[PDB]
């Protein structure tokens, strides 16, 4: 498995996350509703991209803090794949959302953990043994060793790692030899004059590097 | 002033939410769309609630993490007053999100601090030298010594402190000689036989022990 692309969907209305989903869709492996859109339009968006993207992986970006269950089974139900819950959530908001969303989509029912401020790696393997296996890691505010370590350990930890921030064609040589789950991009390649073309040279980059 | 009353709507639906602020709008101090029915039908809510009534106190409750600046903006132009960032939002990020709120509305824009896991005092004090002087304490999952301390403490450093979790008639007297900011209440007023005597019974408490 390479590492999938990931576009992130974070237009303030409807259109633009619709047009930019179809204009990359087929070049991506990965389609996110962006939390700045869902909190904008609320949750159709998930199924209107579902029903786009019948086999394509879907993500609610909810930064869930509680009501977990709710949230992640109001998500689900639209066809979300993967929901967020942001750090500061507590382990039983974790794990409310983790059984919910495994309860409607058990072949594909994820959460991820949105990592924010002072996050620690005791809590990062209390959300392991919630049964919560995935991290959102975003880049310092290019790609300096105190960043790719914390990605390397959150990775020796059992996370499947996703990277976002300052990604570009250009930058993906320097994560070489990392072993990445996901790169989520965003207006890099939905702004591009050729949005497809820019998606597709983004993974073709990722092929050279991990194929 | 008296602490105020909010209730916090968080209905999956439309219909759930404006059904529940119309019942008991003219009872309470501030009216607050919930995270939960955010996500679901998004910012049009705001508006709706914003002329329904329109010299309330609105709550946007987006539990902003990133993108602070939009994410206000979005909301603030929807007519809110009173917008959530999670505490492991950023300072940059909380800064962002400030000044788009008081760009658009002057007179009452304020974030609020929704306080979640293992935030701290120095960062507590990081918030008030940002210009943000609200925070939303909730009870751990009745009001014993340890989270009224928090509150006292949380008073005593500059912030207008918002209370919620347990909240009835019956509990307000838990925190007689605190000076609460608000206190939140939801679904024990909402969904009661006389939602609008429901709001009333719980204000009037809050004038017989602050009055
Ligand atoms: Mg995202
Ligand atoms: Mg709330």
């Known amino acids: 498995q390479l590492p999938n692309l990931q576009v992130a969907l ?37 199924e209107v991209l579902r029903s786009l993207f019948p086999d394509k992986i879907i993500v609610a970006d909810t930064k869930c803090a509680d ?30 959302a983790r059984k919910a969303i495994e309860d409607i989509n058990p072949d594909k029912g994820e959460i991820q953990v949105e990592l924010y401020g002072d996050w620690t790696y005791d809590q990062a393997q209390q959300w392991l043994d919630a049964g919560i296996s995935q991290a959102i890691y975003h880049q310092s505010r290019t790609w300096g060793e105190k960043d790719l370590n914390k990605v390397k350990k959150l ?24 072993d990445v789950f996901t790169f989520i991009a965003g207006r890099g390649i939905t702004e591009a004059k050729n949005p497809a073309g820019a998606a597709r040279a983004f993974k073709d980059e990722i092929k050279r590097i991990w194929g």
Chains 1, 2 share one sequence.
């Open 155 to 178: 990775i020796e930890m059992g996370f499947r790692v996703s990277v976002t921030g300052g990604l570009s064609v250009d930058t993906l040589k320097l994560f070489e030899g990392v």
């Open 10 to 46: 974070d237009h303030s209305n409807l259109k633009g996350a619709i047009t930019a989903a179809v204009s990359v869709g087929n070049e991506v492996d990965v389609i996110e509703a962006g939390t700045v859109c869902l909190l904008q339009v609320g949750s159709e968006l998930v």
């Open 67 to 96: 009501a977990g269950g709710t949230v992640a089974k109001n998500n689900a139900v639209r066809g979300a794949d993967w929901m967020t819950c942001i750090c500061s959530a507590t382990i039983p908001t974790m794990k409310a």
